[PDB]
Amino acid sequence: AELTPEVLTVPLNSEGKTITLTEKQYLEGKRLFQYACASCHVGGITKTNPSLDLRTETLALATPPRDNIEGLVDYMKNPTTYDGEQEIAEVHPSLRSADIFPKMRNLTEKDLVAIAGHILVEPKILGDKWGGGKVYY
Amino acid sequence: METLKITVYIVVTFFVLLFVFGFLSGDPARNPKRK
Amino acid sequence: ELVNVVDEKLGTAYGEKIDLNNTNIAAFIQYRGLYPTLAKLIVKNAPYESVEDVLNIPGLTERQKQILRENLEHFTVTEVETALVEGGDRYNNGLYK
Amino acid sequence: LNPMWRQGMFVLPFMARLGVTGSWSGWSITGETGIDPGFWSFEGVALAHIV
Amino acid sequence: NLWERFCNWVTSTDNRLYVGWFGVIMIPTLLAATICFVIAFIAAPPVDIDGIREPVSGSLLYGNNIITGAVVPSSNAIGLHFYPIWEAASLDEWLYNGGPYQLIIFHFLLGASCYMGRQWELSYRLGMRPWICVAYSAPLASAFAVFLIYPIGQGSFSDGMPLGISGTFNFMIVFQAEHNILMHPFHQLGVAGVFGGALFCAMHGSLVTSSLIRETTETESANYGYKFGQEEETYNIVAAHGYFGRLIFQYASFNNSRSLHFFLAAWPVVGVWFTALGISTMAFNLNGFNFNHSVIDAKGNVINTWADIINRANLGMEVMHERNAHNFPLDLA
Amino acid sequence: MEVNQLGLIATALFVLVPSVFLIILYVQTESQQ
Amino acid sequence: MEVNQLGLIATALFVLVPSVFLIILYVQTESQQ
Amino acid sequence: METITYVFIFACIIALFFFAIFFREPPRIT
Amino acid sequence: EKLAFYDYIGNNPAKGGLFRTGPMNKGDGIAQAWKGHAVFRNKEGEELFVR
Amino acid sequence: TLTYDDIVGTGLANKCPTLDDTARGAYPIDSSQTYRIARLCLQPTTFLVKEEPKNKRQEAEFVPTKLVTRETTSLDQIQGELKVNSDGSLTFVEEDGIDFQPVTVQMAGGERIPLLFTVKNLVASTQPNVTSITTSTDFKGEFNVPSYRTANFLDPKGRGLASGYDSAIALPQAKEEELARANVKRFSLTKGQISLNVAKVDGRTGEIAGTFESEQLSDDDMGAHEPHEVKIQGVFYASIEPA
Ligand code: CLA
Ligand code: CLA
Ligand code: CLA
Ligand code: CLA
Ligand SMILES: CC(C)=CCC/C(C)=C/CC/C(C)=C/CC/C(C)=C/CC/C(C)=C\CC/C(C)=C/CC/C(C)=C/CC/C(C)=C\CC/C(C)=C\CC1=CC(=O)C(C)=C(C)C1=O
Ligand SMILES: CCCCCCCCCCCCCCCC(=O)OC[C@H](CO[C@@H]1O[C@H](CS(=O)(=O)O)[C@@H](O)[C@H](O)[C@H]1O)OC(=O)CCCCCCCCCCCCCCC
Ligand SMILES: CCCCCCCCCCCCCCCC(=O)OC[C@H](COP(=O)(O)OC[C@@H](O)CO)OC(=O)CCCCCCCCCCCCCCC
Ligand SMILES: CCCCCCCCCCCCO[C@@H]1O[C@H](CO)[C@@H](O[C@H]2O[C@H](CO)[C@@H](O)[C@H](O)[C@H]2O)[C@H](O)[C@H]1O
Ligand SMILES: CCCCCCCCCCCCO[C@@H]1O[C@H](CO)[C@@H](O[C@H]2O[C@H](CO)[C@@H](O)[C@H](O)[C@H]2O)[C@H](O)[C@H]1O
Ligand code: OEX
Ligand SMILES: [Ca+2]
Ligand SMILES: [Cl-]
Ligand SMILES: [Cl-]
């Protein structure tokens, strides 16, 4: 098995348009995920709220859907609850709360796209390990 | 419990004072070779 | 005579759908637009005589009522099991990932 | 209905005869509660004999 | 002067067992710890170790044998709080919360430290070189690590090692679950220390026994060929050196008895120092090596190693240990 | 506890037969001179 | 047959404790000359 | 019954400790 | 109930055996409750007494 | 006004607040104004356990016990609605608070009685025609006693109600009829009765204080054994605010 462009092909929007990430983009997304998110999102789970996770099905059932690149980038800019009824930027890292979350200060749009691409590609690589918790370790 | 606490404090203080003043009572002299 | 009530509840419709009177709130994650606001209202206002009485929760909006109507077929109502709802287990039943 | 002589107690009646009624675990062979036996419970007598 | 006579008696080398000033502290503390241990191991009521009103019975009268019996560590609700008898409202409360464990371990640790000091003291009174106490510092450091330092780092004397055989095994298994001690280099150095200590003990014993000089006939035991206090060496050091130098090569063999016996002292003592330090450093949660999901294929699939199998076993222990005591996802202490 | 019954006598024999054996060999050693 | 279990160990002790006693004395008598 | 056995064996071990310390063969230096 | 328990031949000390070992409870059981005094009558209704 | 550093370690945190000795007033109650209990504290001082006689009919009196779980027994921070009924009786319905404490008391002979000392879902009313809360006001009421262990508790053999084994796995071929009482855990919700006797009133600040006696059952070990009847006696304090 290799990191083929079919593996690195992920939804871009909710309409159905797709994008293909480069391996450098995927590796930079993994590095930035480990830098800014993995302390609470290691393995695709959420440490401080285990009932939600970063599985593609869970992101797809979110409001608005977060199973594409644009939805995940929008979440990184303006995070909300799962039903999209309240904004949670004061307790979740974001660009709009980069003053209280300093690790989000130097994140560019390309960094956000790479992080979103890593989040979307990791289940396709790891199977049930992504978001599975310690059962699948 | 209060009587027990005072008794244990007295016993411990007695043994610790024995230890301290015994090691102050010329312990380096009490060796077989020198002094 | 001596029966485990949780397994008996799994024998009912509690084991197939979301019971409005017994199920832990995290199960409301598995449908769109229920968690956490509508789920909090549903768990707060339980017990329910029937499923459609979830539309009569006070303070519901038109959008939330439409969301509940779209998930009406995913809900059941059973008798309130004491072991499932005591100790605050409807909010935290000790199961994480 | 289950006193000490029904239970094969041989040395418990002699301690009870000379005035040892209570136990460190709270009971009394007289059947009452509350009583503080002090050191001289049945266990205290047994410990004194071992020492 | 009564004080001069008492000082002469305490430091007297003519006593059958030497007392000394370290022994003036050591005898009451070790007597208290021993008496309380025997009484608690036979007759203590069950102890709520995890602080969750789930008492664990460790005494013989409450349904244990020698193997399963233990003095149960004090309650998790107590933590590192000092819990003497007079702090409890009654003896029933003190026994319920595991007060005997704190009494025994505090008296034992003080008495064993004074045992080390007493070893120095007697070596000084006899004109000996003083470093037997340094060798004894390795098991003493181990006792301090499992009874004091690990509770301090973890924040509760409930996480100290229970005073029992099966309680010791429980301590080992939960420790491997939480810290991966097998993958810690200090524990590996400790295993090298104890395996090498057993190896070099068997080696030195067999090499000396092999080179014993013929002093007896075939009927009697060879041990009667040595007389206590004799001046001549009872075995041929050169013959043992010739054997062991032909067994491996000449320069792997000690021809110096003093260097050999220093090596015999030094190898297990340094190894046990390192494993005691491993227990203490894991008490501050600096755990053994974590190689979980270290080997990754070209696509990104996890290729399991033996470390992943160890991780599966550790996960089983982790999710089953103290099965009612955890309310939250992370076992942070 | 519902323990094995023979576990008493076995344990007793496990103490008794070797110990007295050693005791025999000790006492006859002491009476030699 | 519902016999006393302790009887077995009792019988064994009744055999063993005095018998080995005699054996001890006899053996230490034989090694005296 | 089993508790009595364990305590008996332990007490025999402690008695043996006493005799091995205070009634040992004296090391006679030759 | 204690007075009635004294009036019972199982508590007579001259009813045991040389090799009937153990407590008195090992013999007839552990006493739980007095069943009450039994009065026997015939069909006429005259009171009858057990020897 | 004692800070936390003045209180920690001393045991005063388990004590209910006391009213002054020169305070025996009356707190007026308007039938239109709604009232709340802003703070209800219950400090138990005595646990009595009903003995179980061997015979079917006996005295069956309560015996004293020794607390072994230290100063972890008081219920505090309890809030509720204090409504006025049409009969003039005042009804207290609790809503939330620290309304339960697990308590283990030791009977003579070493036996331990765990119980969930609780006033969970307490509804307590007075006698009719109470227009002012005085030192003769009494609150008689009932509460729910849930199971001492909840459904996720695992027994030493790993059996439980909502989690765990359903059989004795270490006896794979033993008969399961004799072990059905231990294998099948049951959740019990019993009823308790409590009487709160007002003894001191502060008509200015709205505070009342007095004594309580409650009756409930002890822990049944998820239906393994029968519970014991427990009577709890102590003092209480309640702050009554106009809502
Ligand atoms: C060699 C004597 C000795 C020593 C050192 C100890 C030591 C101890 N006992 Mg103890 N005990 C002893 C004999 C001794 N016991 C005997 C003979 C009995 C039977 C009567 C008991 C019965 C007993 C009970 C029943 C209990 C203890 C407890 C304790 C602990 C705390 C005691 C305390 O608070 O004292 C405080 C008193 C002092 C600190 C005295 C101060 C006097 C000097 C100035 C010391 C200053 C301290 C400073 C660090 C300097 C140290 C000396 C320095 C030169 C190194 C402690 C480990 C308790 C325990 O284990 O709790 C868990 C407990 O409950 N003991
Ligand atoms: C083949 C496999 C193997 C081997 C060889 C070892 C070897 C060792 N392990 Mg280890 N371990 C293993 C597998 C193994 N382990 C596995 C699989 C696990 C996971 C379950 C662990 C988990 C584990 C833990 C958690 C710990 C060890 C420890 C140790 C060390 C114990 C020896 C020691 O500290 O002595 C030193 C001496 C003592 C401990 C005794 C102190 C004696 C005091 C000072 C005096 C006592 C006096 C006494 C009461 C009275 C005497 C009676 C009479 C004369 C009066 C040793 C290096 C321990 C360690 O590192 O030690 C700190 C430790 O805590 N292991
Ligand atoms: C096939 C047999 C075998 C071999 C070769 C080893 C070898 C080893 N084990 Mg191991 N082990 C074995 C069986 C074996 N084990 C079994 C059956 C068990 C129980 C299931 C264990 C349990 C065990 C544990 C729990 C641990 C080890 C550890 C170790 C390492 C250090 C141990 C040590 O110093 O021993 C004492 C022996 C000596 C001090 C003598 C020296 C031996 C060295 C290693 C050989 C050097 C020879 C040299 C390289 C050859 C060329 C020389 C020439 C140029 C002159 C070592 C690699 C430890 C470890 O993982 O360390 C990293 C450790 O923690 N073992
Ligand atoms: C004055 C002596 C005496 C008395 C009256 C009692 C009385 C009692 N004991 Mg007790 N006991 C004693 C000494 C005594 N004990 C001693 C010294 C010990 C330590 C070994 C014990 C250990 C003990 C235990 C462990 C138990 C009792 C129990 C009992 C009760 C039941 C009695 C029973 O089953 O007897 C049975 C008696 C016999 C079967 C008679 C034995 C007859 C011998 C074997 C005849 C020997 C013949 C001889 C070999 C012939 C030699 C001939 C040769 C010279 C030619 C009873 C209250 C039991 C009880 O219920 O307690 C709760 C119990 O469990 N006792
Ligand atoms: C077809 C073919 C090839 C045929 C074979 C025929 C042929 C001619 C072959 C020969 C050629 C040849 C050798 C072949 C090459 C193959 C070869 C290299 C084999 C590999 C061998 C191998 C795998 C390993 C062997 C090396 C090995 C075991 C090393 C271990 C070294 C080791 C750890 C030693 C340390 C020992 C030590 C320092 C500690 C001991 C301390 C101690 C307690 C004892 C010492 C001691 C104690 C006493 O108490 C007394 C009193 C004395 C005094 C004393 O000292
Ligand atoms: C449960 C609560 C109750 C507990 C009960 C405890 C009460 C203790 C009472 C002690 C009474 C005396 C008995 C000891 C006598 C003795 O030992 O003879 C040996 C000699 C006798 O006195 C020596 O011998 C001579 C005396 S004599 O002439 O032989 O009589 C004398 O000349 C010499 O100076 C003197 O040193 O004693 C000595 O050698 C010096 C004192 C050493 C004794 C230390 C005790 C052991 C402590 C070990 C701690 C851990 C133990 C754990 C178990 C494995
Ligand atoms: C006669 C030997 C019997 C051995 C049986 C047990 C073997 C154990 C397994 C192998 C171990 C190898 C180590 C030997 C090491 C070795 O090399 O030994 C050799 C040694 C004899 O060597 P030497 O002739 O040099 O004698 C050495 C003397 O100088 C002593 O210093 O043998 C013995 O003395 C051992 C005797 C048995 C010791 C154990 C006794 C077992 C008792 C168990 C309880 C019985 C209860 C019975 C209940 C009914
Ligand atoms: C909690 C304890 C710590 C506080 C107290 C200690 C503070 C330091 C003050 C120093 C006191 C030392 O005082 C010390 O006492 C002993 C007892 O009289 C003296 O006297 C001793 O002398 C010789 C040894 O030289 C002995 O044979 C003699 O029997 C003995 O009396 C010491 O010569 C003196 O040095
Ligand atoms: C190395 C030997 C040292 C000495 C050991 C012997 C000392 C005397 C022991 C007396 C023990 C009491 O007496 C003996 O007790 C055991 C229980 O313990 C009883 O046994 C009874 O109870 C157990 C439960 O404990 C039941 O499972 C068992 O079926 C039943 O028989 C015996 O019927 C009785 O005879
Ligand atoms: O106590 Mn004894 O072990 Ca140390 O981790 Mn947390 O706490 Mn419990 O769990 Mn895992
Ligand atoms: Ca009143
Ligand atoms: Cl555990
Ligand atoms: Cl937790």
Domain range list for chain A: 2-137
C2 to chain A, closest Cα gap in Å? 32
Q: Are strands J132-133 and C75-76 parallel, antiparallel or unpaired?
A: unpaired
The structural domains of chain J, ordered by start, are: 21-149+186-243 (2.40.160.30), 150-185 (3.30.2050.10)
Pocket test for ligand 7, best of E201, E223, E224, E235 (most atoms within 8 A of CB): E223
Q: What is each CA distance from J89 to E284, J119, J132, J195, J201, in whole angstroms?
A: 60, 20, 10, 15, 18
Distance in angstroms (rounded) separating the CA atoms of residues C12 and A18: 43
Q: What are the backbone dihedrals phi and psi of residue I18, each rounded to the nearest 5 degrees, phi first?
A: -65, -40
- Label the pairing between strands J123-125 and J62-64: unpaired
Q: What are the E-state strand segments in chain E?
A: 70-71, 163-164
Closest listed residue to residue J84, CA positions, set J2, J165, J28? J28
Residue count of chain I? 51
d(CA E270, CA E138): 8
What is the token pair recorded at A132? 């599975």
Distances, alpha carbon I6 to alpha carbons D31, I3, I9, I10, in Å: 18, 5, 8, 9
D-contacting chains (≥3 CB pairs under 8 Å) = I, J
Residues of chain H in contact with residue F15, where contact means CB-CB under 8 angstroms, are 9, 12
Measured CA to CA, the distance from residue G20 to residue F22 in angstroms comes to 11
The nearest alpha carbon in chain H to F9 belongs to H5
Question: Which residue has a Cα nearest atom 17 of ligand 1?
Answer: E28
Class of domain E2-179: mainly alpha
Q: Which two tokens stand for residue A46?
A: 């959420």
Any idea which residue has 């595991």 for tokens? E98
C-alpha C29/C-alpha E224 separation (Å) is: 84
| J200 alpha carbon – ligand 11 mean position (Å) | 8
Pocket of ligand 4 (CB under 6 A): D 8, 10; I 19, 21-23
- Check E60 against H3: CB less than 8 A apart: yes
- Alpha-carbon distance of E209 to E222, in angstroms, equals 9
Whole-number Å distance between alpha carbons of E208 and E237: 8
Query: Nearest CA to A41 among A124, A136, A115?
Result: A115
CA E38/CA E59 separation, integer angstroms? 10
Report helix angle E2-10 to E20-43, nearest 10: 70
Where are any strands of DSSP class E within chain F?
none
The answer for I 1-51 residues in CB contact with D (under 8 A) is: 1-2, 5, 11, 22-26, 30-34
Contacts with E, B 1-35, CB within 8 Å: 1-2, 4-5, 8, 11, 15-16, 18-19, 22-23, 25, 27, 30-33
Report the alpha-carbon distance of residue J184 to residue J178 in Å, rounded. 11
Nearest CB to C36 within list A46, A58, A82: A82
Q: How many residues does chain A have?
A: 137
Residues with Cβ within 8 Å of J220's Cβ and at least 6 positions away in sequence, in order, are J147, J148, J186, J188, J226, J227
| Residue E84 CA: distances (Å) to CA of A93, D39, E257, J214 | 48, 20, 50, 34
Q: In degrees rounded to 5, what are phi and psi of residue F14?
A: -65, -35
Provide residues with CB under 6 Å of ligand 1.
B 8-9, 11-13, 15-16, 20; E 25, 28-29, 32, 83-85, 102-103, 106-107, 110
Pick the CATH number of A2-137 from 2.60.40.1170, 3.40.220.10, 1.10.760.10, 1.20.1250.20: 1.10.760.10
Cα four-point dihedral sign E158, E279, E261, B28: negative
**Helix ranges, chain J (H):** 180-183
CA distance C60 to E78: 48
**Contact call for residues E21 and B23 (beta carbons, < 8 A):** yes
Q: Which residue has the tokens 């499992």?
A: E146
Residue J106, CB-side half-sphere exposure with 13 Å CA sphere = 25
Ligand closest to CA E173: 2
Q: Hey, what are A16's tokens?
A: 């159905």
A92 is in an annotated binding site: yes
Distance from CA of E302 to the nearest CA of H (A): 52
**Strand-pair category, C18-19 with C75-76:** parallel
CA distance E179 to E159: 13
Residue with tokens 């003497």: E84
* Helix E306-320 × helix E165-179 angle, to 10°: 120
Label residue I9 exposed, middle or buried (CB < 10 Å: 0-12, 13-18, 19+): exposed
Q: E strands, chain J, where?
A: 27-28, 35-50, 62-64, 66-67, 75-84, 90-98, 100-106, 112-118, 123-125, 132-133, 138-145, 190-201, 207-217, 229-242
CA torsion E7-E9-E12-E16 (nearest 10°) is -150
Q: How far apart are CA E171 and CA E177, in angstroms?
A: 10
How far B21 CA lies from chain E's nearest CA (Å)? 9
DSSP notation for C43-81: HHH---SSGGGGGG-TT--HHHHHHHHHTGGGEE-----
- Whether E121 lines ligand 10, by a CB cut-off of 6 Å, is no
D46 CA → ligand 12 middle, Å? 36
Residue A82 CA to chain centroid, in angstroms? 14
> Does residue F12 have its Cβ closer than 6 Å to ligand 7?
no
The answer to whether I30 and D2 have CB atoms below 8 angstroms apart is yes
Could you give the C-alpha distances from A17 to A14, A74, J112, in angstroms and in order? 7, 16, 68
- The rounded Cα E270 to chain-centroid distance in angstroms is 14
CA angle B2, B6, B11 (to 5 degrees): 145
Structure tokens at J164: 């765990």
Q: C16, C62, C23: which is closest to C39 by C-alpha? A: C23
* Cα–Cα distance measured from residue E91 to residue E73, given in angstroms and rounded to the nearest whole number: 16
Residue A118 assigned ligand-binding role: no
Q: What is the torsional sign of CA C1, C7, C9, C10?
A: negative
DSSP letters of J69-131?
Answer: S-S---EEEEEEEEEE-TTS-EEEEEEEEE-EEEEEEEPTTS-EEEEEEE-TT-EEE--S--S
In b/e form, how buried is each residue of E44-83, taking b as 16+ CB within 10 angstroms? bbbbbbbbbbbbbbbbbebebeeeebbbbbbbbbbbeeeb
DSSP state of B31: S
Q: Which residues contact E124 (CB under 8 A, 6 or more apart)?
A: B31, E130
* CA proximity to E46, closest of J44, J101, J156: J156
To the nearest 10 degrees (0 to 180), the angle between helices E99-125 and E20-43 is 150
Under an 8 A CB cutoff, do F27 and G28 touch?
yes
d(CA J207, CA J185): 44
Q: Which residues, including other chains, have CB under 8 Å from residue E71's CB and lie 6 or more apart?
A: E37, E40, E41, E44, E58, E100, E101, E104, E162, E163, E164
> Could you give all domains of chain C from N- to C-terminal order, each with its CATH number?
1-86 (1.10.150.320)
Experimental method: cryo-EM
Mark residue J86 as left, alpha or beta (left: phi above 0; alpha: psi -120 to 50; beta: remaining).
alpha
Contact E66, E41 (CB under 8 A): no
Residue in E295, E294, E298, E304 with CA at minimum distance from that of residue A26 = E298
J151–C3 C-beta distance less than 8 A = no
The CA distance from H23 to H26, in Å, is 8
Q: What is the resolution of this structure in A?
A: 2.2
- C-alpha closest to that of J183 among C1, C83, C15, E47: C1
Token pair listed for E240: 């043992």
Residues within 6 Å of ligand 5 by CB: E 200, 203-204, 207-208, 237, 240-241, 244, 248, 252-254, 260
Spatial CB neighbours of A95, under 8 Å, sequence gap ≥ 6: A76, A77, A104, A107, A112
Say if the Cβ atoms of A125 and E329 lie within 8 Å.
no
User: How far, in Å, CA of F24 to CA of G26, rounded?
Assistant: 9
Could you tell me how many residues make up chain J?
243
Which ligand 3 atom sits nearest the alpha carbon of residue E182? 64
C96/E327 Cβ within 8 A: no
Partner residue opposite C36 with nearest CB, options A83, A131, A134? A83
The one-letter code for the residue type at F21 is F
d(CA A33, CA A120): 12
For chain G, after which residues does the C atom lie more than 2.5 Å from the next written residue's N, i.e. where is it broken?
none
Structure tokens at E211: 């080179």
